[PDB]
Amino acid sequence: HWGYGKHNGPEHWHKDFPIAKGERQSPVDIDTHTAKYDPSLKPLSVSYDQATSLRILNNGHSFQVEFDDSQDKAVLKGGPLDGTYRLIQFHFHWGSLDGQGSEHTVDKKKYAAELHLVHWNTKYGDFGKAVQQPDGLAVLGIFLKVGSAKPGLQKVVDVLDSIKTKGKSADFTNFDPRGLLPESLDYWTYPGSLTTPPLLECVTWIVLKEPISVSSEQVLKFRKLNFNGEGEPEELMVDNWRPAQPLKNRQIKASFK
Ligand SMILES: O=S(=O)(O)/C=C/c1cc(Br)ccc1O
Ligand SMILES: [Zn+2]
Numbered sequence: 001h002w003g004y005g006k007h008n009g010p011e012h013w014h015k016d017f018p019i020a021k022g023e024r025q026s027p028v029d030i031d032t033h034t035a036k037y038d039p040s041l042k043p044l045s046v047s048y049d050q051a052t053s054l055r056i057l058n059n060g061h062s063f064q065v066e067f068d069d070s071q072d073k074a075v076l077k078g079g080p081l082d083g084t085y086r087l088i089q090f091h092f093h094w095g096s097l098d099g100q101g102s103e104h105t106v107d108k109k110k111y112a113a114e115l116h117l118v119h120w121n122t123k124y125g126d127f128g129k130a131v132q133q134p135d136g137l138a139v140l141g142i143f144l145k146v147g148s149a150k151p152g153l154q155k156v157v158d159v160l161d162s163i164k165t166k167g168k169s170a171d172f173t174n175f176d177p178r179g180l181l182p183e184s185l186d187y188w189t190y191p192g193s194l195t196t197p198p199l200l201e202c203v204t205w206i207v208l209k210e211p212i213s214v215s216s217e218q219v220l221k222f223r224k225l226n227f228n229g230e231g232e233p234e235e236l237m238v239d240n241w242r243p244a245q246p247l248k249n250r251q252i253k254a255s256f257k
Pocket of ligand 1: 088089116118139193194195196197198203
């Protein structure tokens, strides 16, 4: 099946998922000089105080932390968005080296990793219906650079040895995703897609300008995860990022001057 290797990686995905060569694919390079400040953007509202985390899962291509989205508990509103989008999960993309790993790039700069907080538009009733809609998802993308440790990432790092291999999960209740946010909510936004198969074109991307800093030790522990299942030979889960795709007929808007 699809993956990130030479024989099943991003350059192969279009064969099963022809939308891979579509008109609004993600990620993209964010050219900071050509992004347009947009006065029509409303303030971004990240309301995570009532977030209810459930479980952490190695899904064979990343690890994901899942949330209870049966009610409006952790939501994203405002910015480019109309209506209320509920947090369903977050996951990461990262590199084998500190100079690569992010999916979006900034003036072609790659960061060590990228966090995706995935939300769905509650007018569509459930996540599976939302992905079939052009405005179904809002994903908040946050870059990670290597420097000082991020305290609010450490509870995630500490449980990774319990989900080393594909299909392993662990309880992950009472985790506060507010600890993963940078100070500033300044962002760029554009219409795009899921960056993994099925690559559906259902995502309003909101990528924050300010990266979070994480320690070399924290990112090293990401890189000890496995793509393989238990009792198979070890393939380190590294470089699980899709590279930048053609911008095509899109403008990236900035929330700031
Ligand atoms: O916008 S993405 O970060 O690519 C979200 C991806 C994604 C999220 C969920 Br939840 C399920 C399947 C998926 O492919
Ligand atoms: Zn992602």
